[PDB]
Amino acid sequence: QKVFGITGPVSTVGATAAENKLNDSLIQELKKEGSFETEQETANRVQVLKILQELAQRFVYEVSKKKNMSDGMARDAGGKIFTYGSYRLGVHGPGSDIDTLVVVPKHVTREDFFTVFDSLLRERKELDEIAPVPDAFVPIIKIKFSGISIDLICARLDQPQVPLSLTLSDKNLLRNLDEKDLRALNGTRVTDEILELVPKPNVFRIALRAIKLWAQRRAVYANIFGFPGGVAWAMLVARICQLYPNACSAVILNRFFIILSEWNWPQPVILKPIEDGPLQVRVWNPKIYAQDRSHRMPVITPAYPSMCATHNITESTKKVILQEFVRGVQITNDIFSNKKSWANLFEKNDFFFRYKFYLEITAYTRGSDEQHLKWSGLVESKVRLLVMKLEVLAGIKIAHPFTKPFESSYCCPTEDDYEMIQDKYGSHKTETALNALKLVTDEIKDAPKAYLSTMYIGLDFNIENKKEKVDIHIPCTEFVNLCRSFNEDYGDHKVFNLALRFVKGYDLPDEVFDENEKRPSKK
Length: 523
Fold this sequence. Notes:
Elements: H1 17-32, H2 39-66, H3 71-77, E1 80-84, H4 85-89, E2 98-104, H5 110-122, E3 127-133, E4 140-145, E5 148-156, H6 179-196, H7 201-217, H8 230-243, H9 249-261, H10 290-293, H11 315-336, H12 342-345, E6 357-366, H13 369-381, H14 383-391, E7 396-401, E8 406-411, H15 417-424, E9 449-461, H16 473-483, E10 496-504
Parallel strand pairs: 2-5
Antiparallel strand pairs: 1-2, 3-4, 4-5, 6-9, 6-10, 7-9, 8-9
Helix pairs in contact: 2-3, 2-5, 7-8, 7-9, 8-9, 9-11
C-alpha cells in the first residue's frame, strides 16, 4: 500500500482511449529525441556489468589472499557491485554513464581499490580508458569499457563477508561506517527505494524520461546551481505516480505540472514516512535544524537517513522552477485539447534573449588542466552564494543562473598576454582582440596555456527611484574575496584570477549562441 504514498491516491481511474492516444505520441516523441538506446546496447551494458561483478570478486579474492586468508575464506569474502542513478531506474539513454557501486568487506581498503582493482581493470582487453580520482571528494575511478561509460566508487562495510545475495535495505549496515562509506552507499539505497515506492514502474519510467529531457531543455536541471538534480526530479515524478496509480504517463505529466506548480512550498515532498534510527544522525527535520527550515522547495530522500536533495535552491531559482511548472501546465492542457504537441513542451529555453542585463563570471588560470578543474570547480560551486546575496537586494527582480559553464583555452604565451585576456574577454565590442592569441580547438603542438571558465547570471531590475539606484559591486568583491581564501595559492594573481563583468544582452559574447541564432541590438 506504500506504493500509493503517504496520502493514498487522488484517483484510481485508469487511462481512457483518448489519454492513451497521447501517451503513444509521448513515447514516439521521446523516440525521436533519442531517449532510448538500442536493445543491443542494453544487452552490452548487462554484459559489461556481469564482467565487473567477476572483477569485484577477483579484487576481493586477491586482497583477502594477501591478508593471509584461506581459499574458502577468500572466496567467502565475496564482493558485489550495485548500480544506481539513471541506469538502475531504467531511464538511461545513448551515451549515459552507468553509476556503479563496489561494496567490499572490512579488510579491503581504498588503497586496495586504487591499486589491485585498478590493475584488474587495465589487464582487460575491453578497457578503452581509465581515470582514477583518488583525491576525490567522492572517491571514484571513471572508465570507458567496451564503449560503455562506467563510474565506479567503492564502499567498505564493517563486516567480514560480502556474499553474492547481499542487499542494502538494512540500516544496521550503516552503523560504524565513516562519512565516505555512508555517502557511497546512500545513492543505491535511494534508487532501490524509489523503485519500490511507485505503483507502476513502466509508467514511472516514461514520465521520468520526459521530465529529464524537459528539465535539461528548460535549463532547470543542475544541482550545483540551485536547480533539482536527477535524483530530485526522480522523486518528484515518483510522488505524482503515487497519486494516480492507474494513469498512463501522459496524464502523470499533466498532473505533475499542476500539482507541483500549486504545491504549498516549502511543505516537503515525501515518498514514505520519514524514519529515524541509530545515533543523533543526519535526518532531515525542520523542527530541529535551522539549515532545514530554510529549504525552499524540499524534496526528501526516502532511504534512512532521509535528506533533502534540493538544498541548493534559492529565491531566484524557486521562481524559475515555478514559471516552468506553469508553462508546463498551459502547454500540456493545450496538448490534451489538441492545440499543441509534445515538441512544444520540449523547446529549448531562450536564456540569452530574455534579459536586458547579464552578469559574467570568469575563472582564470595560468597552469595545467589539473589546476583549472580545481580552481573553476570551486568558483562554480560558489555561484549560488552570489545569487543569494544578489537576489535579496532591493533593486533586483531576479538573479537567474544559467546551468552550463562556458570553457575555453589559449596558448598564452608570455605573462603580458595573460593580462590582455583579462582585459578583452567577455564583451563583443572588444572581443576579437584575443584573435592575436592561438585558441585551442582540435587539435597537437602545445605547452603554456591560460584557462577560462565562464558562468552566466541573468539579471532583472525593479523600477528604481532615479535617486536610489542599485549597486552590485559590493557583493561582487565580497564574492571574489570569498573565493580567494580556499587554499592560499588562489591569492597568486600571477596564475589565478576572477573577473566579474556586467554586460548588456547585445554586448554578449558569440560563444553563447547556437548555430541557429543571433541577437539584434538595442539603440
